[PDB]
Amino acid sequence: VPQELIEKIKLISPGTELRKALDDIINANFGALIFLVDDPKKYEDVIQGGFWLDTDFSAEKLYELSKMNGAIVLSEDITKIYYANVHLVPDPTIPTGETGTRHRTAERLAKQTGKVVIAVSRRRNIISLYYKNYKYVVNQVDFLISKVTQAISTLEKYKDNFNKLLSELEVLELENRVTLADVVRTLAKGFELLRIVEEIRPYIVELGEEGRLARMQLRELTEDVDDLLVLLIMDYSSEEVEEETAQNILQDFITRREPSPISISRVLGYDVQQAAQLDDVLVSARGYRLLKTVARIPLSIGYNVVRMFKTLDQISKASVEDLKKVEGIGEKRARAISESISSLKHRKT
Amino acid sequence: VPQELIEKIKLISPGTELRKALDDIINANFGALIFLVDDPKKYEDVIQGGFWLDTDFSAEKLYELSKMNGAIVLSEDITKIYYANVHLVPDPTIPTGETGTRHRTAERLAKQTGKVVIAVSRRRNIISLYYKNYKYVVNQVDFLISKVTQAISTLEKYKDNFNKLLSELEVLELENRVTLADVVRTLAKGFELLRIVEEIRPYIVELGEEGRLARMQLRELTEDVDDLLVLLIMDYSSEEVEEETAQNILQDFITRREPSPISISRVLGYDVQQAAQLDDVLVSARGYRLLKTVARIPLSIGYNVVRMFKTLDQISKASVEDLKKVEGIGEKRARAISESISSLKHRKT
């Protein structure tokens, strides 16, 4: 979905005076056919009849005008009403797959001029936006709230399962009993969860000002999940991996690749092709997750800690003095590392 | 109103199945937009979308299809329905005086193709027919009947006054006391009566089958007025006048010139400059009106009677023996001429 078109969709998103007018028009079963231009003179050959207005835009004015037959011409910045009650005459030879004169005119006119045209028919409650060779149908808020509320409820269930997987993983991590199956299962659930977020994003955007609570909910449910998955990938990949690399593996499984167990464990660098194999592959966390998240050790410095001790298990055996040899670890960070791991072992295992 | 257009108007006149369908369509407040062509696949460029039907016409089929959006395509003789639900796309650059997409389309397409296009708007009850550069509005029957009923009632009054003038003139004629004013006064009323018939004629045509009674009424009211006015012109023009010329006089004051007293007398060959002079000009009927109408003498033979006796006054003094000396007058025509005049002189004077 081009960014060019997304800028146009903003024009009619909940919160704008234009959208407010269009909601009133839909509510009254008036139709609408609206043409957005910056220089009316340049387009005087596709504009016939009607009334020259040249007056400041308002929602109420647009509403009143739409009671009349034909079309309305506004400035692109939606600050002026230029014409009302006009006949729009785009080139009839331009292909269109729309139905009815109103929507066939709209799509032809947008194709012909490279401008936005908005059509509302009298009996439906959708707003059809046309820009160049684009068509975007904009939905009512109540339809969008419904899908988004469902998506959020779905995200809650994925997130709860993710937390359960993770808390079990933690236990296994601290006891050094993790298998590849355990990692992959946890990553998959994380990947799927953020996929759902990506898929609902267009709905969220369409909601405009009415999507504010929805965005807050997404943010709260997904807050640290991306960082968490990146750290897991750095901790459990077959060979050592830089952060931005792990970030890309996340990007890949969120958007382009399917998060099947074999696919994940393969891209983590393991050579398995049967799902049952994962249970037999023993893995040991590098320790990045615990270092950044719990001991609050910056990644740049955690590299050196992993450089020296290789795995979490060995880090958990190091004394404060042992840790202090690392490039970046003073007594502050050394006790942070030492005490936070041991605290965790005590309470969790 | 060119004969070419009148033929097309017949297509939608009361009585035709097409008009019966348009009537229902008007009554249901469906609109209509109908394109008449014999070769559909040649007009492929101006007809988009819709359904190809190619089915035999009926009023009920047309009505049913008019429920759908857009336009309908029929054969020029209204025998086939070719398309329904189509989008008509005439050249947008053709000048049009119409208002609304429907009527602006109809006019432009009619001009572009030389074919009939019919448009009915949803809330108005008229049928607008476009043919080439012609536009003809066809009215509802109740409207036409009201005008025609008034026009006929108006005619009864003119006709009553014409009769009263005529019978007064009859008396003056039989007593040889006719002035040019009496003649002109009678002619003028007859002229005006026939003008009214001319003005109402388009409404009557427009009424189609619903104008049968109205035609009979006009026929009864005017059936011999024209012949009567022709014979008056032949009896009172200053210089002898052939029948053909007299009919051309009649035709002139019915259409071209206005039947003013001075003007009528001037055309009759009397150098008059003021209406008050008409009362001083004495005239004598040659006798054609009486010879044709009352004695049943053919005009051809009439001339021979007039060339001999010059005026009605002299004819009324001629004996049977005198009259038989005329070419074409046997003993029966002679006694027909003499007894009909003496009979009228006895009864009317």
Ligand SMILES: Nc1ncnc2c1ncn2[C@@H]1O[C@@H]2COP(=O)(O)O[C@H]3[C@@H](O)[C@H](n4cnc5c(N)ncnc54)O[C@@H]3COP(=O)(O)O[C@H]2[C@H]1O
């Ligand atoms: N070229 C054509 N070919 C076939 N049928 C034609 C036609 N032009 C008009 N009609 C028919 O007349 C109906 C009423 O059009 P109206 O202009 O009143 O109402 C129109 C008009 O107010 C507006 N609108 C549509 N096209 C427009 C255009 N090019 N320019 C400006 N306004 C337009 O959309 C309304 C709904 O049109 P809708 O199609 O439902 O219904 C149309 C359509 O069925």
